[PDB]
């Protein structure tokens, strides 16, 4: 049984928030994975990208921890990446799944050429950066699939991107930086100002303001 700890968690549990998009619209930090389980926890698939043993030198031996890099996301419009380090591999994977749920971002999908049907690719060329690793996503024609390395391909497929060209530069052999750079590129899709987003924003009531009475009275 989920007992919310934050105001956003209370609003989500009490069915005051009707989708993840109202939370995204106000950039509110999601600090409970149960919110993500509530909103997408019927289509989310997890995948451990890597288990990496890191070591800290000590007086009488090397202390070894394991870092789990886990990608998550329903294969439509949402993806997250989580990196968690712990002394136990199972605990690391559990923490990484929780962290990937906490970092799920909306993915903007667009059209390569003409706009028949549902969006299938990235709206424009986006670039993500992480420690000398540069990952570029380029819109591709329908039916080409993901033209990428396996590590960015996993995240692009979990993001719902049907087809996309990619370019990589740097030390992509470091899976963590590669994954974080492609996650940055994916998350920059909705932060890009395209001419279809020039329409003035019609501000609405924030969840904390539109259900302030419910929070007070519950």
């Amino acid at each position: 049984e989920w007992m919310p700890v934050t105001k956003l968690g209370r609003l989500v549990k009490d069915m005051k928030i009707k989708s993840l998009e109202e939370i995204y619209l106000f950039s509110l930090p999601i600090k409970e994975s149960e919110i993500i389980d509530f909103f997408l926890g019927a289509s989310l698939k997890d995948e451990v990208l890597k288990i990496m043993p890191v070591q800290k030198q000590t007086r009488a031996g090397q202390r070894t921890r394991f870092k789990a890099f886990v990608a998550i996301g329903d294969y439509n419009g949402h993806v997250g990446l989580g990196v968690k380090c712990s002394k136990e591999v199972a605990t690391a994977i559990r923490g990484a799944i929780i962290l990937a749920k906490l970092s799920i971002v909306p993915v903007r999908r667009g059209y390569w050429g003409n706009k028949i049907g549902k969006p299938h690719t990235v709206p424009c060329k986006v670039t993500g950066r992480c420690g000398s690793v540069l990952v570029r996503l380029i819109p591709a024609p329908r039916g080409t699939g993901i033209v990428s390395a396996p590590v960015p391909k996993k995240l692009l497929m979990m993001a719902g991107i049907d087809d996309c060209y990619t370019s990589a530069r740097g030390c992509t052999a470091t899976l963590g930086n590669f994954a974080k750079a492609t996650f940055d590129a994916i998350s920059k899709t909705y932060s890009y100002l395209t001419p279809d987003l020039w329409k003035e924003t019609v501000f609405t009531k924030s969840p904390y303001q539109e259900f302030t009475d419910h929070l007070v009275k519950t």
Binding site: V48, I51, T64, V89
Partner: peptide
């Protein structure tokens, strides 16, 4: 299942290290 996880934590840098790390997920 957790057999690979457990045998990996016995020897993180042993002979059966890349094999088990790959067997976890690849």
């Amino acid at each position: 299942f957790s057999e690979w996880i457990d045998d990996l934590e016995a020897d993180p840098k042993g002979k059966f290290a890349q094999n088990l790390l790959k067997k976890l997920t690849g």
